[PDB]
Amino acid sequence: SELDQLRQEAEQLKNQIRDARKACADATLSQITNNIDPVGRIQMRTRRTLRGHLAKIYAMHWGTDSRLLVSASQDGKLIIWDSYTTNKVHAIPLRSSWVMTCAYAPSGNYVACGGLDNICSIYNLKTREGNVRVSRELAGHTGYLSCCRFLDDNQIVTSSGDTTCALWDIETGQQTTTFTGHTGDVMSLSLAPDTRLFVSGACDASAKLWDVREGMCRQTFTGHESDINAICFFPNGNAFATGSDDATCRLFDLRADQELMTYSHDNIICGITSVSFSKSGRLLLAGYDDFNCNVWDALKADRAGVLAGHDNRVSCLGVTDDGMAVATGSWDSFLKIWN
Template structure:
């Protein structure tokens, strides 16, 4: 009798949750009148050449230094670039060349971080005066697996994700974990911090789910399903109401935080490879994604269940190997892509 009562209560809770979701899901893309995108494409304006190994990650600086970015390569170097002039502002040799992620601190633009198969998050000062830096100011050690992604939350804290299926929120000055998030059942491949509320972040994992976390609650707030394979990349919509994902199932998807549901899918029968990275334009109209087939495809984020990209980067101006990372500058004026062909390209 007790088991039956428990099952009945569980079913009632499920129905109540579904009802609340449907109440928040008060419209679809198909019901909206959407103006078409103008015929346009991105052109490669700059080429950042200086790495001698595969480029694995890049990240733009904050708005006060919107033309700067940091990149990480298998050659064992972090390079801080001025994307406008293509000058290398700082080169940082790493203890381990197996780097998988890098991040630029967004408030003061005076720190960069990286990590990879060494299981560490290493943080370096960027002062603009010295051209080389050899020693990390902090090395954060608590993960039991490779570091897949890191993102600063202000100048005092950083968020990391790992192959050990966890995310950790750190105090940089003390070098100590403040919170650990263990809700995923597979490697966590990417994290993104909410653009207006630094207590919230979203993650993507090899368990094919993405999750919303609240640092104050030290746990998962919501789980988003829909992908059929590893989620390699997550990124927030500019207003923070939605986020986009990219997966090995060859699709990008958009999820809404208000109704806890998927609101759009972007995939094509002609694109059969995985997605490595995603980003939104400053207006949110464009979803940009880097692919294993050397291409960067641009989707109309408002077009329902898009079956083909709005446009793609020119093959003649594109990369000659896997597009491993991409990002839109903090002022929205440029797109940078990094590739296993050792190059970074800046489009506008």
């Protein structure tokens, strides 16, 4: 049968990819970085507590100026905070509730909300009237829109719940490219510092490194047993870490094409709802479901510290582009700015 013989050559391709990765497995990251000096204790304390949401916070995103941060409440308000003066710089009511993602453009001019209404709405900020208006309601997804990011003020990559992630252009309000390589509901994405490649992850434990210009999936990473909930790049763009519901963070490479290090403690059984890296990348910050945020040594896989400051689970975590502080927005309507 032709279908079964192409499936058999597909498993031939899978097995040759697997033994290629095992041939590339010359050592492990623990063996390479065993002799480095340990981090020890990361005693960051809550410096500010942004408290203005009436529901669960579901996403946050800093700005590239490392001062403003946008936050998406479950009830349907994007509050754009100053992390310095603890002041709501903007407050945006949304047309529908249950937004799971918000994105801050690197220029600072745009924010983007997305939820289970299958529409990524782009709100302009620096208008002449001063009011925040919805610029474009990017619609065309059928599933829930799960993680949106800005490449620049016209290109926005939106994961969705119909196993796709689409790159949209805003001025025409369309999909320039669609990325359909997943079988599960795509739960996260994270752009690289190169802003030309990004990893999206779904419920099928597959993290695809795509490529935004050519439009096809460059490579595919497995290793989890549950839904991958959050992905974040390393600060150089050469590696990325995923946090899934299997209580494991996994740092994969992009040039070694396989998993470099796992992060799990036996005390931790809770799923990871957010991950990000420090500015040096030495500290992998992971917001779990045990109401905490563990900061792991990303080269020795030791739990360097714990951040226990929330009454509900930590939906969104994020480090500034200057690496100064980490906003751990949680479901208890708090945004604690640890530093």
